[PDB]
Amino acid sequence: SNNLDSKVGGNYNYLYRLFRKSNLKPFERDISTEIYQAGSTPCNGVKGF
């Protein structure tokens, strides 16, 4: 889809999930935007180390 979906600065409208707790189940769809905790710390608000 080179022709249609690529923009010179970048077509950043195509989002994908990069961080969550466990894998999803077959044909599950997850729409959560909530922050992922990568450390042993709990994490809150909007952003964290």
Binding site: R29, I31, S32, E34
Partner: protein, 48 residues
Amino acid sequence: NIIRGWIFGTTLDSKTQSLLIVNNATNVVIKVCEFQFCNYPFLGVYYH
């Protein structure tokens, strides 16, 4: 006819998606949205 539907999901609080199943006076409606459900959800009627 006092039971008119069910709610299903994870958080049930618009943080995430959930399912609404209702049978109203007129049709069965089934819908799946990030609902902010009413804390006591229900339906009701004018009689005769």
